[PDB]
Design a protein around this ligand. Structure first.
Ligand SMILES: [Mg+2]
Ligand SMILES: [Mg+2]
Ligand SMILES: [Mg+2]
Ligand SMILES: [Mg+2]
Ligand SMILES: [Mg+2]
Ligand SMILES: [Mg+2]
Ligand SMILES: [Mg+2]
Ligand SMILES: [Mg+2]
Ligand SMILES: [Mg+2]
Ligand SMILES: [Mg+2]
Ligand SMILES: [Mg+2]
Ligand SMILES: [Mg+2]
Ligand SMILES: [Mg+2]
Ligand SMILES: [Mg+2]
Ligand SMILES: [Mg+2]
Ligand SMILES: [Mg+2]
Ligand SMILES: [Mg+2]
Ligand SMILES: [Mg+2]
Ligand SMILES: [Mg+2]
Ligand SMILES: [Mg+2]
Ligand SMILES: [Mg+2]
Ligand SMILES: [Mg+2]
Ligand SMILES: [Mg+2]
Ligand SMILES: [Mg+2]
Ligand SMILES: [Mg+2]
Ligand SMILES: [Mg+2]
Ligand SMILES: [Mg+2]
Ligand SMILES: [Mg+2]
Ligand SMILES: [Mg+2]
Ligand SMILES: [Mg+2]
Ligand SMILES: [Mg+2]
Ligand SMILES: [Mg+2]
Ligand SMILES: [Mg+2]
Ligand SMILES: [Mg+2]
Ligand SMILES: [Mg+2]
Ligand SMILES: [Mg+2]
Ligand SMILES: [Mg+2]
Ligand SMILES: [Mg+2]
Ligand SMILES: [Mg+2]
Ligand SMILES: [Mg+2]
Ligand SMILES: [Mg+2]
Ligand SMILES: [Mg+2]
Ligand SMILES: [Mg+2]
Ligand SMILES: [Mg+2]
Ligand SMILES: [Mg+2]
Ligand SMILES: [Mg+2]
Ligand SMILES: [Mg+2]
Ligand SMILES: [Mg+2]
Ligand SMILES: [Mg+2]
Ligand SMILES: [Mg+2]
Ligand SMILES: [Mg+2]
Ligand SMILES: [Mg+2]
Ligand SMILES: [Mg+2]
Ligand SMILES: [Mg+2]
Ligand SMILES: [Mg+2]
Ligand SMILES: [Mg+2]
Ligand SMILES: [Mg+2]
Ligand SMILES: [Mg+2]
Ligand SMILES: [Mg+2]
Ligand SMILES: [Mg+2]
Ligand SMILES: [Mg+2]
Ligand SMILES: [Mg+2]
Ligand SMILES: [Mg+2]
Ligand SMILES: [Mg+2]
Ligand SMILES: [Mg+2]
Ligand SMILES: [Mg+2]
Ligand SMILES: [Mg+2]
Ligand SMILES: [Mg+2]
Ligand SMILES: [Mg+2]
Ligand SMILES: [Mg+2]
Ligand SMILES: [Mg+2]
Ligand SMILES: [Mg+2]
Ligand SMILES: [Mg+2]
Ligand SMILES: [Mg+2]
Ligand SMILES: [Mg+2]
Ligand SMILES: [Mg+2]
Ligand SMILES: [Mg+2]
Ligand SMILES: [Mg+2]
Ligand SMILES: [Mg+2]
Ligand SMILES: [Mg+2]
Ligand SMILES: [Mg+2]
Ligand SMILES: [Mg+2]
Ligand SMILES: [Mg+2]
Ligand SMILES: [Mg+2]
Ligand SMILES: [Mg+2]
Ligand SMILES: [Mg+2]
Ligand SMILES: [Mg+2]
Ligand SMILES: [Mg+2]
Ligand SMILES: [Mg+2]
Ligand SMILES: [Mg+2]
Ligand SMILES: [Mg+2]
Ligand SMILES: [Mg+2]
Ligand SMILES: [Mg+2]
Ligand SMILES: [Mg+2]
Ligand SMILES: [Mg+2]
Ligand SMILES: [Mg+2]
Ligand SMILES: [Mg+2]
Ligand SMILES: [Mg+2]
Ligand SMILES: [Mg+2]
Ligand SMILES: [Mg+2]
Ligand SMILES: [Mg+2]
Ligand SMILES: [Mg+2]
Ligand SMILES: [Mg+2]
Ligand SMILES: [Mg+2]
Ligand SMILES: [Mg+2]
Ligand SMILES: [Mg+2]
Ligand SMILES: [Mg+2]
Ligand SMILES: [Mg+2]
Ligand SMILES: [Mg+2]
Ligand SMILES: [Mg+2]
Ligand SMILES: [Mg+2]
Ligand SMILES: [Mg+2]
Ligand SMILES: [Mg+2]
Ligand SMILES: [Mg+2]
Ligand SMILES: [Mg+2]
Ligand SMILES: [Mg+2]
Ligand SMILES: [Mg+2]
Ligand SMILES: [Mg+2]
Ligand SMILES: [Mg+2]
Ligand SMILES: [Mg+2]
Ligand SMILES: [Mg+2]
Ligand SMILES: [Mg+2]
Ligand SMILES: [Mg+2]
Ligand SMILES: [Mg+2]
Ligand SMILES: [Mg+2]
Ligand SMILES: [Mg+2]
Ligand SMILES: [Mg+2]
Ligand SMILES: [Mg+2]
Ligand SMILES: [Mg+2]
Ligand SMILES: [Mg+2]
Ligand SMILES: [Mg+2]
Ligand SMILES: [Mg+2]
Ligand SMILES: [Mg+2]
Ligand SMILES: [Mg+2]
Ligand SMILES: [Mg+2]
Ligand SMILES: [Mg+2]
Ligand SMILES: [Mg+2]
Ligand SMILES: [Mg+2]
Ligand SMILES: [Mg+2]
Ligand SMILES: [Mg+2]
Ligand SMILES: [Mg+2]
Ligand SMILES: [Mg+2]
Ligand SMILES: [Mg+2]
Ligand SMILES: [Mg+2]
Ligand SMILES: [Mg+2]
Ligand SMILES: [Mg+2]
Ligand SMILES: [Mg+2]
Ligand SMILES: [Mg+2]
Ligand SMILES: [Mg+2]
Ligand SMILES: [Mg+2]
Ligand SMILES: [Mg+2]
Ligand SMILES: [Mg+2]
Ligand SMILES: [Mg+2]
Ligand SMILES: [Mg+2]
Ligand SMILES: [Mg+2]
Ligand SMILES: [Mg+2]
Ligand SMILES: [Mg+2]
Ligand SMILES: [Mg+2]
Ligand SMILES: [Mg+2]
Ligand SMILES: [Mg+2]
Ligand SMILES: [Mg+2]
Ligand SMILES: [Mg+2]
Ligand SMILES: [Mg+2]
Ligand SMILES: [Mg+2]
Ligand SMILES: [Mg+2]
Ligand SMILES: [Mg+2]
Ligand SMILES: [Mg+2]
Ligand SMILES: [Mg+2]
Ligand SMILES: [Mg+2]
Ligand SMILES: [Mg+2]
Ligand SMILES: [Mg+2]
Ligand SMILES: [Mg+2]
Ligand SMILES: [Mg+2]
Ligand SMILES: [Mg+2]
Ligand SMILES: [Mg+2]
Ligand SMILES: [Mg+2]
Ligand SMILES: [Mg+2]
Ligand SMILES: [Mg+2]
Ligand SMILES: [Mg+2]
Ligand SMILES: [Mg+2]
Ligand SMILES: [Mg+2]
Ligand SMILES: [Mg+2]
Ligand SMILES: [Mg+2]
Ligand SMILES: [Mg+2]
Ligand SMILES: [Mg+2]
Ligand SMILES: [Mg+2]
Ligand SMILES: [Mg+2]
Ligand SMILES: [Mg+2]
Ligand SMILES: [Mg+2]
Ligand SMILES: [Mg+2]
Ligand SMILES: [Mg+2]
Ligand SMILES: [Mg+2]
Ligand SMILES: [Mg+2]
Ligand SMILES: [Mg+2]
Ligand SMILES: [Mg+2]
Ligand SMILES: [Mg+2]
Ligand SMILES: [Mg+2]
Ligand SMILES: [Mg+2]
Ligand SMILES: [Mg+2]
Ligand SMILES: [Mg+2]
Ligand SMILES: [Mg+2]
Ligand SMILES: [Mg+2]
Ligand SMILES: [Mg+2]
Ligand SMILES: [Mg+2]
Ligand SMILES: [Mg+2]
Ligand SMILES: [Mg+2]
Ligand SMILES: [Mg+2]
Ligand SMILES: [Mg+2]
Ligand SMILES: [Mg+2]
Ligand SMILES: [Mg+2]
Ligand SMILES: [Mg+2]
Ligand SMILES: [Mg+2]
Ligand SMILES: [Mg+2]
Ligand SMILES: [Mg+2]
Ligand SMILES: [Mg+2]
Ligand SMILES: [Mg+2]
Ligand SMILES: [Mg+2]
Ligand SMILES: [Mg+2]
Ligand SMILES: [Mg+2]
Ligand SMILES: [Mg+2]
Ligand SMILES: [Mg+2]
Ligand SMILES: [Mg+2]
Ligand SMILES: [Mg+2]
Ligand SMILES: [Mg+2]
Ligand SMILES: [Mg+2]
Ligand SMILES: [Mg+2]
Ligand SMILES: [Mg+2]
Ligand SMILES: [Mg+2]
Ligand SMILES: [Mg+2]
Ligand SMILES: [Mg+2]
Ligand SMILES: [Zn+2]
Lengths: 59, 204, 137, 74, 122, 118
RNA sequence: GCACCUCGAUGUCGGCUCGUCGCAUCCUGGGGCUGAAGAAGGUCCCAAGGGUUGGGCUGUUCGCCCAUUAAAGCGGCACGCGAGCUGGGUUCAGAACGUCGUGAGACAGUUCGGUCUCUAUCCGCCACGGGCGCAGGAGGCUUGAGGGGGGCUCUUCCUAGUACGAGAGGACCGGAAGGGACGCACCUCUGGUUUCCCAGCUGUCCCUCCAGGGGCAUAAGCUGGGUAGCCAUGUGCGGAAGGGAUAACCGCUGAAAGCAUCUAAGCGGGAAGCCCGCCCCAAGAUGAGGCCUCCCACGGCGUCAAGCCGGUAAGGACCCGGGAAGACGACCCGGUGGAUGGGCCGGGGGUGUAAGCGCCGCGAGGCGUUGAGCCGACCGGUCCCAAUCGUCCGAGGUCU
RNA sequence: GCAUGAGUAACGAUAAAGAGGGUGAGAAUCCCUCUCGCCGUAAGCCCAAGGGUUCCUACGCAAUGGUCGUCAGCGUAGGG
RNA sequence: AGUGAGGGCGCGAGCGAUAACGUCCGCGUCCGAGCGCGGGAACAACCGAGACCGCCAGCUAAGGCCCCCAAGUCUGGGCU
């Protein structure tokens, strides 16, 4: 190894270009059949504690 | 040209004239024709074959209509045997005789991201005698200021297998029509359960 | 679509039944079809069964024995059509499934470690004396 | 005559490694061979190796002609 | 599965006992030699007043190997040693006795004398 | 590759990974329901299942086997005397895993609960 | 030789690794002449497709030698390759011999020792995605422009002991069989591994005193084995056949030039080479192609914009259960109208006779119950558990 | 003074963790309990140097802590 | 004041090998300082020509006039 090193400063254009993919995705969400509160799908509702009709855990 | 679709089921060996013979087994039959390719319509000759019956409760409307114009219940795979124009309606494993010779095509097993030793059989470095951390490494990849670049297609690590592979001139050891079975002497690319295509061989 | 059954089905036509049961440690005499230039005669081969590796029809077994000084191992397809028969020369009780370790024992030690399997010998004298009253009258 | 050129052995630094300064002249009819990596100059060595090879094929024939004369007298 | 440097017991009465393989005589660059194949070998040790002496370079043919040999009938065979018989340039045995079994492959490969002189062919 | 290999590694070596399953099996059989990272929850699902199923056999041999992993005489009794009855007419699947809607703050680990059934 | 770039640094031999190009060709292929009888050899021409071994000695390159071989080619690529490795050589400081010098020291003289720098920004290269485009939107199946890969060779036998030869030897043409290396794929066999699949064992600490077990001795304590998977030493298969155009070279017909001339018009033959043929990539082939099938008409504004808003259509994406797919993406299967993972059950397979009790022996133990007990992945079954319920996007087709 | 490399290398021994309960605006990281592992001629205990309040109590988290922090050899006061 | 490293080309000599983008002199020239403009594909010094600034005017030089690319697919006459 002989310590590779950037030959030129990266231009603002080229820096930001790289970050064209860095953008975040909004959380995917669904309404609870019970309390109609938004929540992530396939997870037990944190608001009312129901999943698949049943009360799973107590909120 | 003639050929059929099928699924690789596995290997064993049979005995024949007191010699053992390794075989891979292929479930071929049957295969309904779904469309023929004329030169008037398509500019070439081939037949689309159906294979493995499909749950209609999963077939969508464009797919269903193609299947109607055929007049055959839906199917999971559509593939063409080029320059094969079956006189009959459904292609059966019957199209092969014991003794014939076949080219088989399947997808090879998938090595994922593969070293230069597994992908290309490079020797790598010495397991001892001084080597600083290059035990499986590719060595030099070029010259110097001339050409000052790497050849296109230089052998390097990368994805290996999981690709179209055809093995030539396999002997048909045996066929078992009442099970739609096919016995081929040798090995056939890809895992069991995989799709395969069995063409009549091209070697004279 | 049983991939397995499909395979076992193919084999079924080639399966044997006639060969007798045996285990590692048993001494065994395989009469085998061989080729002398033109002809085909039977050669016997007899030694300790040092190993059986099962895989349905594809199961096989290794016999070890010494001849004229040199030790020899032979590996037989259990359903080989070249096996004419198999004789049980003697039965012994091994404490494990793979007996390669006897590769390095004096024929005295080999003898001391591999005692005769009385139970299975008794059963063997028991049976066959069993099936004999109908092979009669 | 076959002449071989190649890199000399031992001291010299940069230059001794990148310079085919060693000479090996093989006189074909007799199989007699000399080598010279004395000086840094390749022809200074070819000169020397041509000098020795000369003296050695001469001396080899003189001896032949000697134990012919010396043994025809016996 | 013999290769250069491999030692072998000599299974004859030429007077050698150990020879070390130095070349296998299949092909331009054959990796290993097996039963029925011919090797060039050096005599590494021998009994007094035998025909072959130590340091003789000789031809020989492998008759037994520790690596099991496969067979078309699906069988296989393996011995406890690697053995060979020294042979002349016409590939005939330079001895008059061979010792221990030899592998049936010798028959097919050609070596007929060796098979006769053998105590048992396996 | 990894083709057709079964079983998680969970960034632990063999000796630790096993203790992990046991210590989670202890806790689960103890409290009836626990909260863990989702992958641990899925491995543990089958591990507790098999021990419970052994208790359904009730015999001494079964008890001595289950002791090896649970190590607690007291706890094992609860399993045989109180948990196994509850399942005499149920073939496997004595356990269930449900994913939660909350991650951990400090490392963002997705959580899930694992519990015995009715 | 010169001193033109480089002394605010262009790391210098050999080895290893990976090669690629040249052809003045080492081998294989096709030829002419021969002091070519045949077999061989010599010399020259064409030909770069592929091939071109393993060791002893020395740091060696070179070279000698052993054993083979069809052959063991020669060169370029900073005498290719140290941000790829080595560091034996060379080229610091130690030390010694010979040697030169009064000396300090010195030596294309020799000898022993002697720090080789984790992070790749751009180009290049191997792989894999995201975006947009492909003037209606889709789901499939395809065409192959242009690329890539591959291309080696030997021995034996028949023809036939024939043609040839005094003999020794010994063919062309045509046909057959078995090899070496290399390539691709595979796990039936052979052979490895198989970090907890089974068993045995030592020490110690613990549970519970016995029995039985558990921890630790490695990140498996050790040992004997070992499925699936990944594998080579194992198995299959490959190079071709053939079509076309040619090179050197051999010819037909044929003038100029009454004859002759392979050529000036025209024709035939002819290489492991060329173009096809075989395998693989492939429509970002912006020259964005083709075929089958599906969806439909605008719901409203907007002059100048073929624009916009925004519900839907065929469909698609999201999330979830998974996957011989995989770094992540991607790809494939499945999501209750369900066998996708987990458990349970069966089969296969591994280990090799569990615990408990009974009997025998003072006992260590032995025998029986017993091929028992345990039993990853493989092949299947089973809704017991888990893929709940849902959400978002997506035409309404510009002009002659 | 501020960029680039770049949300990249690294987060300092591969002795190892898990769950429950509590506290709190906030908890993988604080407290309590059970389980697991590691050291044990030490990785335990006691002197001497050196360091100079780091000791105990209560309140507290901006910074220090390679993350977090309700915790601390950190901040404030009191005591010793 | 600066300069007292010059360089290329043509010609005349020495050295060199009637080698060198070689070296050393002599006459001239240009680059140096005209790496400003046209030509010679590209190109300090070869051909043309010495740029004070502006113009959507004109003539010529070298070199060119088939397309890239301005102007003759010009006109006679030969050769290959
Ligand atoms: Mg910006
Ligand atoms: Mg993203
Ligand atoms: Mg709802
Ligand atoms: Mg919410
Ligand atoms: Mg046909
Ligand atoms: Mg049909
Ligand atoms: Mg049909
Ligand atoms: Mg019909
Ligand atoms: Mg029909
Ligand atoms: Mg019909
Ligand atoms: Mg048919
Ligand atoms: Mg994979
Ligand atoms: Mg290679
Ligand atoms: Mg490397
Ligand atoms: Mg270049
Ligand atoms: Mg290359
Ligand atoms: Mg790479
Ligand atoms: Mg891939
Ligand atoms: Mg590949
Ligand atoms: Mg292929
Ligand atoms: Mg049928
Ligand atoms: Mg196969
Ligand atoms: Mg043909
Ligand atoms: Mg016969
Ligand atoms: Mg086995
Ligand atoms: Mg014996
Ligand atoms: Mg005795
Ligand atoms: Mg027994
Ligand atoms: Mg019997
Ligand atoms: Mg030379
Ligand atoms: Mg040297
Ligand atoms: Mg040089
Ligand atoms: Mg030089
Ligand atoms: Mg030079
Ligand atoms: Mg000198
Ligand atoms: Mg050979
Ligand atoms: Mg090989
Ligand atoms: Mg075989
Ligand atoms: Mg000889
Ligand atoms: Mg045989
Ligand atoms: Mg005999
Ligand atoms: Mg992989
Ligand atoms: Mg791996
Ligand atoms: Mg880890
Ligand atoms: Mg870890
Ligand atoms: Mg980690
Ligand atoms: Mg609780
Ligand atoms: Mg258990
Ligand atoms: Mg209890
Ligand atoms: Mg129940
Ligand atoms: Mg000068
Ligand atoms: Mg100059
Ligand atoms: Mg160096
Ligand atoms: Mg090498
Ligand atoms: Mg090279
Ligand atoms: Mg040649
Ligand atoms: Mg030739
Ligand atoms: Mg010739
Ligand atoms: Mg002659
Ligand atoms: Mg000549
Ligand atoms: Mg070539
Ligand atoms: Mg080439
Ligand atoms: Mg070559
Ligand atoms: Mg070598
Ligand atoms: Mg060497
Ligand atoms: Mg050496
Ligand atoms: Mg030398
Ligand atoms: Mg050499
Ligand atoms: Mg030769
Ligand atoms: Mg050599
Ligand atoms: Mg080269
Ligand atoms: Mg050179
Ligand atoms: Mg070189
Ligand atoms: Mg050079
Ligand atoms: Mg070179
Ligand atoms: Mg090198
Ligand atoms: Mg280096
Ligand atoms: Mg180097
Ligand atoms: Mg070096
Ligand atoms: Mg040395
Ligand atoms: Mg040195
Ligand atoms: Mg150095
Ligand atoms: Mg020293
Ligand atoms: Mg020194
Ligand atoms: Mg002096
Ligand atoms: Mg002196
Ligand atoms: Mg010298
Ligand atoms: Mg000297
Ligand atoms: Mg030392
Ligand atoms: Mg050293
Ligand atoms: Mg050092
Ligand atoms: Mg160092
Ligand atoms: Mg760049
Ligand atoms: Mg990749
Ligand atoms: Mg990838
Ligand atoms: Mg791809
Ligand atoms: Mg893309
Ligand atoms: Mg993205
Ligand atoms: Mg458009
Ligand atoms: Mg397609
Ligand atoms: Mg193409
Ligand atoms: Mg093409
Ligand atoms: Mg091609
Ligand atoms: Mg090619
Ligand atoms: Mg090629
Ligand atoms: Mg050969
Ligand atoms: Mg012949
Ligand atoms: Mg024939
Ligand atoms: Mg004959
Ligand atoms: Mg004769
Ligand atoms: Mg004769
Ligand atoms: Mg005659
Ligand atoms: Mg024929
Ligand atoms: Mg022939
Ligand atoms: Mg042939
Ligand atoms: Mg093997
Ligand atoms: Mg195995
Ligand atoms: Mg113990
Ligand atoms: Mg213990
Ligand atoms: Mg006890
Ligand atoms: Mg315990
Ligand atoms: Mg412990
Ligand atoms: Mg263990
Ligand atoms: Mg064993
Ligand atoms: Mg083992
Ligand atoms: Mg083990
Ligand atoms: Mg094993
Ligand atoms: Mg296995
Ligand atoms: Mg081999
Ligand atoms: Mg192979
Ligand atoms: Mg082959
Ligand atoms: Mg031509
Ligand atoms: Mg005429
Ligand atoms: Mg004429
Ligand atoms: Mg004529
Ligand atoms: Mg011609
Ligand atoms: Mg003509
Ligand atoms: Mg023609
Ligand atoms: Mg022609
Ligand atoms: Mg012609
Ligand atoms: Mg032709
Ligand atoms: Mg050709
Ligand atoms: Mg070519
Ligand atoms: Mg490609
Ligand atoms: Mg395509
Ligand atoms: Mg394709
Ligand atoms: Mg396409
Ligand atoms: Mg596209
Ligand atoms: Mg299209
Ligand atoms: Mg919408
Ligand atoms: Mg996935
Ligand atoms: Mg998915
Ligand atoms: Mg993945
Ligand atoms: Mg399931
Ligand atoms: Mg069902
Ligand atoms: Mg099972
Ligand atoms: Mg069973
Ligand atoms: Mg079993
Ligand atoms: Mg036990
Ligand atoms: Mg018992
Ligand atoms: Mg069993
Ligand atoms: Mg069993
Ligand atoms: Mg398991
Ligand atoms: Mg369910
Ligand atoms: Mg459910
Ligand atoms: Mg749903
Ligand atoms: Mg909405
Ligand atoms: Mg318009
Ligand atoms: Mg920064
Ligand atoms: Mg930054
Ligand atoms: Mg980030
Ligand atoms: Mg991060
Ligand atoms: Mg990185
Ligand atoms: Mg760092
Ligand atoms: Mg660090
Ligand atoms: Mg990192
Ligand atoms: Mg809690
Ligand atoms: Mg703490
Ligand atoms: Mg503990
Ligand atoms: Mg503790
Ligand atoms: Mg102690
Ligand atoms: Mg001490
Ligand atoms: Mg310690
Ligand atoms: Mg203390
Ligand atoms: Mg103090
Ligand atoms: Mg301090
Ligand atoms: Mg303070
Ligand atoms: Mg505070
Ligand atoms: Mg305060
Ligand atoms: Mg703070
Ligand atoms: Mg804070
Ligand atoms: Mg820190
Ligand atoms: Mg404080
Ligand atoms: Mg205060
Ligand atoms: Mg105090
Ligand atoms: Mg002055
Ligand atoms: Mg002045
Ligand atoms: Mg001056
Ligand atoms: Mg100057
Ligand atoms: Mg001047
Ligand atoms: Mg001048
Ligand atoms: Mg000039
Ligand atoms: Mg001039
Ligand atoms: Mg002159
Ligand atoms: Mg001259
Ligand atoms: Mg001149
Ligand atoms: Mg000149
Ligand atoms: Mg000249
Ligand atoms: Mg000049
Ligand atoms: Mg001059
Ligand atoms: Mg002048
Ligand atoms: Mg100018
Ligand atoms: Mg001027
Ligand atoms: Mg300039
Ligand atoms: Mg100018
Ligand atoms: Mg110009
Ligand atoms: Mg020019
Ligand atoms: Mg210039
Ligand atoms: Mg110039
Ligand atoms: Mg210019
Ligand atoms: Mg200038
Ligand atoms: Mg001019
Ligand atoms: Mg002029
Ligand atoms: Mg004028
Ligand atoms: Mg004008
Ligand atoms: Mg003029
Ligand atoms: Mg003019
Ligand atoms: Mg022009
Ligand atoms: Mg122009
Ligand atoms: Mg124009
Ligand atoms: Zn809710």
């Amino acid at each position: 190894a002989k310590h590779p090193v950037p030959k030129k400063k990266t231009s603002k254009a080229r820096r930001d270009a790289r970050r064209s993919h860095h953008a975040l995705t909004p959380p995917i969400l669904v309404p609870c059949p019970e309390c109609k509160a938004m929540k992530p799908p396939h997870t037990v509702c944190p608001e009312c504690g129901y999943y698949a009709g049943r009360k799973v855990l107590e909120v | 040209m003639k050929g059929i679709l099928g699924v690789k089921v596995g290997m064993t060996r049979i005995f024949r004239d007191d010699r053992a013979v390794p075989v891979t087994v292929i479930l071929a039959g049957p295969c309904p024709v779904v469309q023929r390719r004329t030169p008037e319509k398509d500019g070439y000759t081939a037949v689309q074959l159906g294979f493995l019956p499909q749950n209609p409760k999963r077939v969508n409307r464009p797919l269903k209509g193609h299947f109607a114009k055929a007049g055959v219940e839906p199917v999971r795979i559509l593939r063409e045997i080029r320059d094969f124009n079956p006189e009959g309606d459904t292609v059966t494993v019957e199209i092969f005789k014991p003794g014939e010779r076949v080219d088989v095509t399947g997808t090879s097993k998938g090595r994922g991201f593969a070293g230069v030793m597994k992908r290309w059989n490079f020797a790598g470095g010495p397991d001892s005698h001084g080597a600083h951390k290059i035990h499986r490494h590719p060595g030099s990849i070029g010259n110097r200021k001339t050409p000052g670049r790497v050849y296109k297609g230089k052998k390097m690590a990368g994805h290996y297998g999981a690709e179209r592979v055809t093995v030539m001139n396999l002997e048909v050891v045996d066929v078992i029509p009442e099970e739609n079975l096919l016995l081929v002497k040798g090995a056939v690319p890809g895992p069991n359960g995989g799709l395969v295509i069995v063409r009549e061989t091209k070697k004279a | 679509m049983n991939r397995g059954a499909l395979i076992k089905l193919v084999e079924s036509r080639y399966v044997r039944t006639d060969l007798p049961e045996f285990r590692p440690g048993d001494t065994v005499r395989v009469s085998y079809k061989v080729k002398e230039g033109n002809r085909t005669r039977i050669q016997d081969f007899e030694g300790i069964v040092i190993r059986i590796r099962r895989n349905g029809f594809n199961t096989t077994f290794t016999v070890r024995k010494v001849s004229y000084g040199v030790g020899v191992e032979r590996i037989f397809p259990l359903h080989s059509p070249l096996i004419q028969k198999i004789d049980i020369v003697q039965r012994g009780r091994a404490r494990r499934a793979k007996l390669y370790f006897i590769r390095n024992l004096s024929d005295r030690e080999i003898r001391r470690k591999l005692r005769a399997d009385r139970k299975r010998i008794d059963k063997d004298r028991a049976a066959e004396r069993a099936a004999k009253e109908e092979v009669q009258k | 005559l076959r002449i071989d050129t190649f890199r000399s052995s031992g001291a010299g630094g940069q230059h001794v490694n990148t310079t085919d300064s060693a000479i090996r002249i093989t006189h074909l009819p007799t199989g007699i061979v000399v080598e010279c990596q004395d000086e840094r100059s390749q022809h200074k060595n070819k000169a020397k190796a041509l000098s020795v090879l000369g003296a050695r094929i001469h001396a080899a024939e003189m001896a032949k002609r000697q134990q012919a004369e010396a043994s025809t007298r016996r | 599965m013999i290769q250069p440097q491999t030692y072998l017991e000599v299974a004859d009465n030429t007077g050698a006992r150990k020879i070390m393989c130095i070349r296998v005589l299949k092909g331009s660059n054959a990796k290993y030699a097996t039963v029925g194949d011919v090797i060039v070998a050096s005599v590494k040790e021998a009994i007094p007043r035998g025909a072959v002496k130590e340091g003789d370079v000789v031809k020989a043919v492998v008759v037994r190997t520790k690596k099991e040999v496969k067979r078309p009938d699906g069988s296989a065979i393996r011995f406890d040693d690697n053995a060979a018989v020294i042979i002349n340039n016409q590939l005939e045995p330079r001895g008059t006795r061979v010792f221990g079994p030899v592998a049936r492959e010798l028959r097919e490969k050609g070596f007929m004398k060796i098979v006769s002189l053998a105590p048992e062919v396996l | 590759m990894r083709h057709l290999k079964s079983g998680r590694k969970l960034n632990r070596h063999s000796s630790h990974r096993l203790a992990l399953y046991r210590n989670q099996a202890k806790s689960l059989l103890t409290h009836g329901r626990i909260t863990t990272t989702v992958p641990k929850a899925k491995e543990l699902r089958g591990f507790v299942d098999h021990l419970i199923h052994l208790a359904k056999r009730g015999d001494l041999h079964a008890r001595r086997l289950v002791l090896r992993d649970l190590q607690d005489v007291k706890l094992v009794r609860k399993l045989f005397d109180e948990i196994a009855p509850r399942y005499r007419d149920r073939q496997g699947g004595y356990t269930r895993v449900l994913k939660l809607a909350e991650r951990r703050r400090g490392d963002g680990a997705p959580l899930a609960l694992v519990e015995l059934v009715e």
